[PDB]
Design a protein around this nucleic acid. Structure first.
Ligand SMILES: Cc1cn([C@H]2C[C@H](O)[C@@H](COP(=O)(O)OP(=O)(O)OP(=O)(O)O)O2)c(=O)[nH]c1=O
Ligand SMILES: [Mg+2]
Ligand SMILES: [Zn+2]
Ligand SMILES: [Zn+2]
Ligand SMILES: [Zn+2]
Ligand SMILES: [Zn+2]
Length: 924
DNA sequence: CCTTAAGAGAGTCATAGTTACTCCCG
DNA sequence: GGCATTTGGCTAT
RNA sequence: AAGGUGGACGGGCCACCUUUACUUAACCCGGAAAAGGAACAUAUAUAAUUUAUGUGUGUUCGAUAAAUAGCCAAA
DNA sequence: CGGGAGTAACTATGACTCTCTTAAAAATGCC
């Protein structure tokens, strides 16, 4: 890296030995003239280095063992410190020690111009057609074989023989199938279906079903005919198959097993399957160990349960075995006769079992690939369809007797009177044991079930570890590896980790190191290197990039220091994209878009409230056995800490401890505090950058341009953002607090303070621009007066009784009414500024009643002031004038947005004019 | 036509309090 | 052609 | 050296020329940047590896990927 | 094998000191 030594505020460039004005001008010269993005700064007193300049200048004023680690030559004073160092910094060395102690002519440069213009065209096209694909392209860098493998996979009947001694969780409730399908039940399920999904081979989509049959009458007769006959017709049995990749890496895409066959059926069959699955899910209660596809947040509960069990086994000095398995090709391998036998064990109503058997009786499908080429027609004789609404319920009913057997005769891990042998989330299964030899009993139960039903386990995803207590602390994997189907398992050694439900588990520490920082750096660099405009980059970060962090940051329980590190990185990236000064307030970034902000998410505000709500959600779970393994006191103390740290009230903390037509209901657990309104409240308390911000608090009209900025140039947008934050670089802003060395006077006149209010409102160099602004606003109001057939006396000359001259802008005459309107554009600096502006523009002409009467031959005369804010404030009382003119309710809102946008960007034009006549006059 | 100001954030560094242990006598 | 209305992301399997 | 145009535009930097001429390789930063690019289909021509070579004219470079749950945000 | 006593590296709060130039809306639905 290029190395710069900084005690001195003005160093030279090392590429040419030539000095500049400041370190910021050096970074400018290194970036532009040489492309040297890798810069490192050194403290002159002590030789400390960092990549960050501001680190080194904060370093400069404050600038000032008998026992040896055999791994890294670190030195320590006591052996206790050495053992603690080897515990923290060197896992699996300490573990071994604990075990041991037990049409121009040519075409050349125009090609490069064509490539650059084409890259810009592609990204600007995708920003307005499909922004989700643009986010994926920025962030993620993403015939005979298919026919032969999938044809030999699907066509052969599975190897199920019999369930044997395996028994399901209780008998069924046959009352659910009694009452007929109503049209409102169909309406509720159509509201709960996915909104924009693909059609089947018959080509009808869900919106077409609504258009063909609005009241759901015809589909009701069709679905009840299917339900009482108990057989589906042959016209829906055909399906299509589309392949989805399982991993983004090109190293994996050649292998056929990393492609997932998604089978899509008819829309009416799919809706009918969801309607039947609701009733069959009511009829068949599952074993509570199964947390996948049910109406619960199973991921949070399973991660919390595994984390608490791993922590508690260490703290109570008890042995604990953990094994992770999952089923290979889980939906594709399950036999139809297995599902039918599982339904018959429950004594489900035989008409319903006949219907379920009939729906899988003659399914056939064809695979499409290479965008529009198809293979044959393949009989589906094994497996449920991935993408049919009924298949998760059928897979859960097929996997239920294994979980019941593991509860019944598996040797689990105890706490008090209760025990846990198994945990399930879909096909993912975790086995727990209180001893090493007990896991062989659990594994042989799993082997017996896989031999009876014909299922198989993915050997690539079978892992495990064993914790064994000692006098002080514990050892990991001081044993032989377990074997499932002969092959030994991958025993997870300390310091290494494997995935479980998206997070990673390490036996040494629990839920492993997050790695969010490297992902955030990588994503910010890829957003920066896209050919996009700055607010487009800000929108890619705002909407798509930041929600990817929230699940991992929630469930791994990240504390505040890493959150504020990520927040610092985010807001430095945003302020460097938008060309804002580093001293710009945080609240323009963090307030809501209707508050006048950008709507970027503060992690240190959002994440502790999400974690606190997660703990409250887990504590009110219906799973009564999981709550007996919860560490009650640590959960209450952690909820208290997260409630206080999120900004909640210390004194009001919560304590955390027909049927077919009613819409689905959820509990909404209490939220600590509204952090975004707290950001806006601390914006209004600033002295200079918060001046007049209270005008824009909930005005959806004045902040319309921050959302819909499409037809505005970005120079004008960034100057509007600088004028709203009051961080535009006039000389008053270049002084601020640094008052000893700089001049605050105006460049063009003798006025003492060169504020932005001086430039916009009062300075004599911008007088023609203010006159043209006022005239254009009066023309915009005049055309709306013309459109409703008002006769306009524009700019009269009225001489009063004392022969003084007055000039109102507009008089509007219709049906003996006369409306005297006077327009002004005031820079807003208080909550009451435009109201006083309207009052003083009323007060200027109120005596002129009778003169306006004989001028316009009118009977009734009213006088109205029409103020506008120079930074886009729409005054609320101007709707009275617009509704007296008689505009419709939508057209008033649209005109209000037009007036506010015109006033703001004409003030931007005034500020640009002042900057231009300032700069270009320097030579003459 | 217009009527005039008010540093804020980034960054280091010190103090002292948890967490998960380590090691040695009665 | 007036008038009104409404417009999102992410994770697990 | 000095006056110039050229590298879409502004700032750098480079190439070319000599009172407006020679004609242009290769690049950086940006608040500027909507195809003289790539894959195909198809007409036409030459010197048949014609599944060629050289031009022209049009499509595309996006969604067309389904399911069951859950969370966050606005409301 | 209980039970003091003692750390490494996080965590959580205050209290400072540092920095200050990139031109010339829109798609769908209803009256
Ligand atoms: C990931 C995924 C899974 N599923 C269902 C189908 C799967 O059979 C079941 C379990 O998924 P997985 O275990 O992730 O997939 P798999 O076991 O079928 O593939 P592999 O053997 O290579 O691991 O969840 C979906 O329906 N949609 C999805 O997007
Ligand atoms: Mg699987
Ligand atoms: Zn240099
Ligand atoms: Zn130093
Ligand atoms: Zn070491
Ligand atoms: Zn002035």
């Amino acid at each position: 890296k290029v190395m710069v030594t900084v005690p001195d505020k003005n160093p030279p460039c090392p590429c040419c030995g030539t000095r500049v004005n400041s370190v910021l001008n050096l970074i400018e010269h290194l970036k532009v003239s040489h492309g040297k993005r890798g810069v490192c700064f050194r403290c002159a007193k002590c030789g400390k280095e960092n990549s960050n300049y501001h680190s080194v200048v904060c370093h400069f004023p404050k600038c000032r063992g008998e026992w040896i680690c055999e791994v890294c030559n670190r030195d320590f004073t006591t052996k206790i410190g050495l053992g603690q160092h080897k515990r923290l910094a060197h896992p699996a060395v300490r573990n071994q020690e604990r075990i041991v102690a037990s049409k121009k002519p040519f075409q050349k440069w125009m090609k490069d111009r064509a490539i650059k213009k084409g890259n810009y065209l592609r990204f600007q096209r995708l920003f307005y057609l499909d922004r989700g694909k643009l986010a994926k392209i920025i962030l993620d860098d993403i015939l005979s074989e298919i026919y032969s493998v999938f044809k030999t996979r699907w066509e052969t009947t599975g190897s199920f023989k019999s369930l044997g001694d395996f028994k399901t969780y209780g008998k069924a409730d046959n009352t659910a199938f009694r009452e007929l399908i109503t049209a409102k039940e169909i309406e509720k399920n159509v509201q709960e279906m996915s909104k924009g999904s693909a059609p089947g081979p018959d080509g009808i989509t869900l919106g077409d079903v609504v258009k063909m049959d609005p009241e759901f009458s015809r589909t009701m007769e069709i679905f009840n005919l299917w339900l009482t006959t108990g057989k589906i017709p042959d016209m829906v049995r055909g399906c299509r198959t589309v392949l989805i990749p399982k991993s983004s890496k090109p190293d994996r895409l050649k292998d056929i097993n990393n492609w997932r066959p998604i089978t899509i059926g008819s829309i009416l069959l799919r809706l009918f399957s969801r309607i039947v699955t609701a009733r069959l899910s009511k009829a068949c209660p599952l074993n509570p160990r199964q947390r996948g596809f049910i109406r619960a947040a199973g991921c949070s509960e399973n991660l919390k349960l595994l984390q608490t069990i791993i922590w508690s086994a260490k703290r109570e000095h008890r042995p604990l075995g953990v094994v992770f398995v999952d089923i290979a090709k889980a939906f594709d391998t399950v036999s139809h006769q297995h599902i039918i036998h599982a339904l018959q064990q429950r004594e489900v109503d035989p008409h319903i079992v006949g219907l379920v058997s009939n729906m899988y009786e003659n399914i056939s499908t064809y695979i499409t690939t290479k965008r529009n080429t198809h293979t044959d027609k393949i009989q589906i004789r094994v497996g449920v369809k991935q993408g049919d609404p009924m298949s998760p319920l059928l897979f859960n009913l097929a996997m239920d007797p294994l979980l019941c057997k593991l509860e019944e005769s598996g040797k689990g891990y105890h706490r008090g009177q209760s025990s846990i042998t198994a945990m399930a989330f879909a096909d993912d299964l975790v086995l727990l044991s209180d001893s090493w030899e007990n896991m062989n009993t659990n594994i042989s139960i799993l082997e017996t079930f896989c031999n009876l039903t014909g299922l198989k386990t993915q050997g690539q995803k079978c892992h495990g570890f064993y914790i064994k207590p000692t006098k002080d602390s514990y050892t990991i994997n001081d044993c032989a590896a377990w074997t499932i189907n002969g092959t030994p398992l991958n025993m997870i050694d300390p310091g290494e980790s494997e995935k479980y439900l998206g997070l990673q588990f390490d036996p040494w520490i629990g839920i492993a190191r997050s790695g969010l920082s490297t992902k955030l750096d990588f994503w910010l660099q890829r957003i920066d290197q896209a050919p996009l405009k700055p607010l487009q980059k800000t929108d890619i970060l705002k909407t798509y990039t930041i929600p990817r962090l929230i699940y991992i940051a929630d469930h791994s329980e990240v504390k505040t220091a890493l959150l504020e590190t990520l927040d610092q990185k985010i807001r430095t990236a945003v302020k460097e994209w938008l060309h804002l000064p580093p001293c710009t307030c945080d609240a323009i970034l963090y307030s809501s878009t209707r508050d006048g902000g950008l709507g970027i998410t503060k992690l240190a505000g959002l994440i502790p409230s999400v974690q606190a709500r997660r703990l409250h959600r887990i504590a009110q779970s219906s799973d009564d056995t999981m709550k007996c393994f919860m560490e009650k006191e640590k959960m209450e103390q952690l909820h208290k800490k997260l409630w206080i740290q999120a900004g909640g009230d210390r004194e009001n903390i919560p304590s955390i401890w027909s049927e077919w037509e009613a819409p689905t209901q959820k509990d909404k657990f209490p939220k600590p505090c509204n952090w975004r309104k707290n950001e806006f409240k601390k914006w209004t308390k600033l002295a200079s950058q918060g001046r007049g911000i209270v005008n824009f608090e909930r005005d959806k009209i004045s902040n319309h341009w921050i959302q819909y900025y499409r037809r505005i140039p970005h120079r004008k947008l960034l100057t509007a953002l600088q004028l709203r934050a009051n961080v535009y670089p006039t000389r008053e802003f270049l002084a601020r607090g640094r008052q000893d060395q700089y001049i605050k006077a105006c460049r063009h006149c003798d006025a003492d303070i060169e504020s932005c209010a001086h430039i916009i409102g009062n300075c004599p160099v911008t007088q023609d621009a203010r006159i043209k602004r006022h005239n254009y606003i009066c023309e915009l109001l005049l055309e709306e007066a013309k459109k409703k057939d008002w006769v306009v006396f524009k700019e009269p000359h009225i001489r009063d009784s004392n022969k003084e001259l007055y000039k109102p802008d507009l008089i509007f005459v219709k049906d003996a009414r006369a409306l005297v309107v006077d327009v002004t554009v005031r820079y807003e600096a208080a909550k009451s500024s435009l109201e006083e502006a309207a009052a003083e523009k009323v007060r200027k002409y109120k005596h002129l009643e009778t003169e306006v009467r004989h001028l316009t031959n009118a009977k009734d005369v009213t006088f109205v002031g029409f103020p506008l804010g120079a930074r886009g404030k729409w005054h609320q009382d101007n709707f009275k004038l617009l509704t007296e003119l008689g505009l419709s309710k939508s057209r008033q809102v649209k005109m209000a947005e037009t007036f506010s946008t015109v006033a703001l960007f004409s003030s931007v034009d005034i500020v640009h004019m002042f900057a231009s006549r300032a700069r270009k006059s320097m030579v003459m």
